[PDB]
Ligand binder design. Structure first.
Ligand SMILES: [Cu+2]
Ligand SMILES: [Cu+2]
Ligand SMILES: [Cu+2]
Ligand SMILES: [Cu+]
Ligand SMILES: [Cu+]
Ligand SMILES: [Cu+]
Lengths: 336, 336, 337
């Protein structure tokens, strides 16, 4: 493309929405390539991540853990204005795994408190991709303090199965999974710290054990359960995007399946089918497509069940509709 | 199918056999869909898992760790009579990853001691699938106490490679891999308990380290060696089903390969080929197909070699037949 | 083939080179099957694995960690002369995951100090494959002491993508990733040992935690950085072979991708495409193919970033050439709000 051609492309501002929700978009690209414009403000803030009042000094894109899902189409440009308010204490940047060059954008986006930057990259590859902060000399600490999210680069013609049949979802959720490493005193009580930097040395010690104290969805134990369960109806087609910026995970829909799973997250690699449990390596995003067939409460988990039910990696779906006795039936209910 | 149509289908009662053996079945489906009937009694028993006399309070489907492999074909119905004897102390249930609805059957099969239940589900998706117990509030504890197995849902026309060529095995073995988390006293000696519930609190602390004390096949270190080594001959086609309900594994046949590997365990997902070491995520089953070409002793391991040779994850195959010097020869035997 | 037909085949003696470099070879096979001959001497040697001077008594094929990459084509015979010099103290052997029978060759290559052996096998399956020592009773200790490498069995017609299109690399690197388990004292400082045997019991304890103290490329923290960084140019096609004989890894090129990735390492299994981060399970090798599009520094890491940046699993590429502002541009450089 010529300089004038790039310059002439339409520019569109998109307002972001907090996870697990996803901003309005079209599955099939509406017209030619665009420069899609997003803005995110970085917030350093204390968050509580469990029922014991455990604190983390979060580093949060757009104020959330994970950061929001940005959606564009292949060969669009993504143009991010990233803002680091003067009230923050650390330099921050952004690495888009979807982008090509300068450490994914990290080398071009180092902003001190009181600074902003604008990065544009061409989204040449279709898929879901991780993004994360990566300040040289403290990369893992930034990432495991929650400074990560994902984007989706849809094929211009939307999603398809391995045989080129269209796969069109009715809704989409983004589940960001976070490993946290919270220091404890010798009595086993989680420690609290006045300033983010104060926790650095104690936290790295925990990190080096490679054993998270908490593994959570949407930034806290139980964030996506109970009255915050995700929703669907029988017959509804749902895409579940799942990311993990630092550590492996194995998602599983209890009572369901991944009908089509782009386990690697890349849409030019044909999806696996009929999956019980899929695998997303640390530093990647994946996506599963499922049509609900049964009503009721589902759990959606990391299928290391210790991580799911002891460490926090469990969400719910509440699904409306009619029960299908062909698929499953209690022939004899639990009885003496 | 309507209730009436289901009621009219032929019934077939199957008698289960202890792992690693697999009950009598046909690879190609005999006739139209049927209701395949299985019965399992839950046994809570002490198992010894290593040569140091270390004990686990097992929770065992059909009295074994893993539970037995159930084999059906796609679009058959699997009808399980699950029995929880008065000699047990805990509520138990079953989640079939192969099933659709009610948390894989777990919501509909909660049986107190002295109770039984019958669940029927349509096996709509072909592949190997995990099944496991999942009592709300105690899910990981049930699973890592050995309450898990697998089923195989064969395609009605049997197995095929990625290009439609038939793959027919002569032998089939089922390896269930188990991560155990056994508490230790202050001298590093493993603890013994006189009732299952007594170990709970201590065990949860070990589980939270995400570091198993033992990783075993068929419920114990060395279980599938010696009297229980798997057997074959040169020229024989062998299918090895492998499950792990809670934790990742990486199977490898030492001296062999996985000629065809359904690493995700799902038969509509084309198999990988010529594998050295495959990968099965926690909460899943996989299957490898191999034609033996050399006689001798083989080891079959989780290829984290610490897990294989320090923690217990190693089995043997004993293979009869003629040595093939074209494939491999000692040109100069070890010498000065 | 018969003994006689194999005897008639041409021989090719190859000189191995140290990782991350790879000995001269042809992507598309030159002529018919050959017996390709390699020699490696095993060295039990003290090595330094980080900038602090932490020592490990390594067990090293050809004196390097990892051992060197051997390259043959499908249905060639690989013929290895393996030597265990009298200066060593342990029995050693070799298991080629590429080979069929006798525990990958381990059953036939058990050599005490002062012994040698010659093993030949037919490389029947195309792909990259781990090889490693495996003395019964001491298997994981040998492997996590650095005694492992990889081989590449190219298809006779070179590489192709999943749809038959030829993929020809301009250069190839071999990154061997090593998990080390180094005992610490009550200060938390790494211990040093006079003899390899002295370290055994303390090391097995660390191994049991399943938590390495170091996770490194080419035998040490920072080994593939500075004047030892890998290099490329804009437009250059690079194959990166990556192995891990004992523990999972998740490779990622920061600023790039794996355009085609044989994540399982086996060339008859079609590659994944457009990968951000791929996965290679412990006991396997994988390979990624990438065409560089942008100049500058890249890091190549295990994307458990704690492993990458705290434990040592990070390498650098330095890439020359002209920057592409279409692909990426700083619309507004960091500046005051
Ligand atoms: Cu990254
Ligand atoms: Cu499950
Ligand atoms: Cu091996
Ligand atoms: Cu940051
Ligand atoms: Cu149970
Ligand atoms: Cu050795």
């Amino acid at each position: 493309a010529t300089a004038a051609e790039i310059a002439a492309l339409p520019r569109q501002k998109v307002e972001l929405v907090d996870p697990p929700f996803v901003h309005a978009h079209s599955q099939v690209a509406e017209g030619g390539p665009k420069v899609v414009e997003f803005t995110m403000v970085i917030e350093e803030k204390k968050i509580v991540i469990d029922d014991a009042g455990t604190e983390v000094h979060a580093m949060a894109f757009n104020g959330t853990v994970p950061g929001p899902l940005m959606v564009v189409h292949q060969d669009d440009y993504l143009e991010l204005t990233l803002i680091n308010p003067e009230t923050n204490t650390l330099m921050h940047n952004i690495d888009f795994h979807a982008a090509t060059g300068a450490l994914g954008g990290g080398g071009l986006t180092e902003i001190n408190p009181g600074e902003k930057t604008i990065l544009r990259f061409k989204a040449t590859k279709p898929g879901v991709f991780v993004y994360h902060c990566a300040p040289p000399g403290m990369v893992p600490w930034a990432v495991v303090s929650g400074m990560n999210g994902a984007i989706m680069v849809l094929p211009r013609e939307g999603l398809h199965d391995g045989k080129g049949k269209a796969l069109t979802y009715d809704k989409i959720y983004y589940v960001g999974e976070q490993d946290f490493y919270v220091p404890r005193d010798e009595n086993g009580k989680y420690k609290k710290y006045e300033a983010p930097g104060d926790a650095y040395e104690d936290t790295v010690k925990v990190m080096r054990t490679l054993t998270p104290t908490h593994v959570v969805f949407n930034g806290a134990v139980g964030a996506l359960t109970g009255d915050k369960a995700m929703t669907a109806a029988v017959g509804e087609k749902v895409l579940i995007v799942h990311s993990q910026a630092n550590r492996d995970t194995r998602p599983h829909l209890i009572g369901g399946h991944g009908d089509y799973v782009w386990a690697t997250g890349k849409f030019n690699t044909p999806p696996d089918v009929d999956q019980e449990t899929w695998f997303i390596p640390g530093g990647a995003a994946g996506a599963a497509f499922y049509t609900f067939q049964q009503p009721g409460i589902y759990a959606y988990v990391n299928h290391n069940l210790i991580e799911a039910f002891e460490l926090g990696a469990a969400a719910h779906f509440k699904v409306t509709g009619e029960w299908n006795d062909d698929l499953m039936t209690s022939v004899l209910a639990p009885s003496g």
